[PDB]
Amino acid sequence: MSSDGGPVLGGVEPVGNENDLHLVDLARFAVTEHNKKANSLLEFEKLVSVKQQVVAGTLYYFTIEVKEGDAKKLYEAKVWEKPWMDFKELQEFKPVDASANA
């Protein structure tokens, strides 16, 4: 006995458990989509975790790791899907190699 209101009450929530086929789909999708317009470049190894943010839709910060060429690191796969209209579109899945501040 325990239930009241949706399992949502905030934003930026940590998650993971590849057990969620959907979650992985996003990360695995990124590498794919990317390999499409990039004719491939790296080799996805697996998924570490994934977050979720609420805004103009449904955002998820996937933190997977892939071995690029002769290297290995983690790429932040960010996807934006919409249930109200069952949609989705890869935003970018990379460790974001850039440093700035203003």
CATH number at residue 28: 3.10.450.10
Strands (E), 22-97: 42-54, 58-68, 73-81, 90-94
Report the number of distinct structural domains present in the chain: 1
CA distances from 7 to 17, 30, 61, 98, 101 (A): 17, 26, 18, 35, 35
Residue 8 domain boundaries: 1-102
What is the 8-class DSSP label of residue 86? T
Specify the experimental method. Answer: NMR
- 3-class state of residue 33 by DSSP: helix
What tokens appear for 101 in the block? 């501040």
Amino acid identity for residue 99 in this structure: S
Q: How far is CA 100 from the centre of its chain?
A: 23
- Phi and psi (nearest 5°) for 80? -135, 100
